[PDB]
Amino acid sequence: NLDSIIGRLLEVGKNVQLTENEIRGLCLKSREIFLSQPILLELEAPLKICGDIHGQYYDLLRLFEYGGFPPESNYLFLGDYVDRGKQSLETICLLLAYKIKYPENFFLLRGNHECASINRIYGFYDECKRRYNIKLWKTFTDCFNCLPIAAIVDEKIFCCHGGLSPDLQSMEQIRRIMRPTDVPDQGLLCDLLWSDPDKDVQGWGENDRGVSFTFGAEVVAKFLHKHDLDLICRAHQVVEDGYEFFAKRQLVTLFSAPNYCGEFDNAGAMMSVDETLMCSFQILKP
Ligand SMILES: [Fe+3]
Ligand SMILES: [Fe+3]
């Protein structure tokens, strides 16, 4: 009942409570699609690229208002759909609904919050327990475990949630990551979901999060030259303007949840990539 699900999702802090069976159907069908597509996506422009949402469903609707509801635009999201916000269920369900309906034009990457042990702590487990049951949360977890990890747009823009890894020598190493899997505490898959650029680090550094690493501008420059890429597009950190460049525009951080978690006064942004690989930004003020 996909059109009916999308309809009720779009009709609207006002909740949308679908049925358990409908939500379970969303997870099972999307999971099949994820596993049928590569773990390293190879995408083509034109595309719109969005950073973190964190359950801010009303802002997700804003993004589609600005960018165009599918299938008017093509979409890549970079992860972190759930936790912290008040409407993770609505958020993730519309995302999974669009993935099933437009599976060659709608793409979702895995963020560090699409991991059971993080969800457990940061709100999604609780929202699932309250509104449905724990068994549903476990169904979401199995779906999350099948999400792809990175994307390359037109052989030039490398996309992932977190950032680079000292263990990332070849793109093939990403392709050999096996799904379903949980995100480990260390290593390539961890770093792709958890690392941060840092202006004050040279090479690889300790990350204040207590997970993964920080990397400096020369690590980015080297990565891009080696792999013949032009840009790293990532998310994972709140930034005042919704996007923010690093390493002389060789990396961009995107963040798509304006007025993040009520605490910050940030804009959200969405990046458009056109057929000539020109990048522009649409800005969503809080
Ligand atoms: Fe996040
Ligand atoms: Fe994150």
From Swiss-Prot:
Phosphorylated. The lineage of its organism: Eukaryota, Metazoa, Chordata, Craniata, Vertebrata. Mn(2+) 1 binds at D52, H54, D80. Its EC number is 3.1.3.16. GO terms for molecular function: cadherin binding involved in cell-cell adhesion; iron ion binding; phosphatase activity; phosphoprotein phosphatase activity; protein phosphatase 1 binding; protein serine/threonine phosphatase activity; ribonucleoprotein complex binding; RNA polymerase II CTD heptapeptide repeat S5 phosphatase activity. Its cofactor is Fe cation; Mn(2+). Belongs to the PPP phosphatase family. PP-1 subfamily. This is Serine/threonine-protein phosphatase PP1-alpha catalytic subunit. Gene3D superfamilies: 3.60.21.10. The gene is PPP1CA. One of its GO terms (cellular component) is glycogen granule. Induction: Up-regulated in synovial fluid mononuclear cells and peripheral blood mononuclear cells from patients with rheumatoid arthritis.
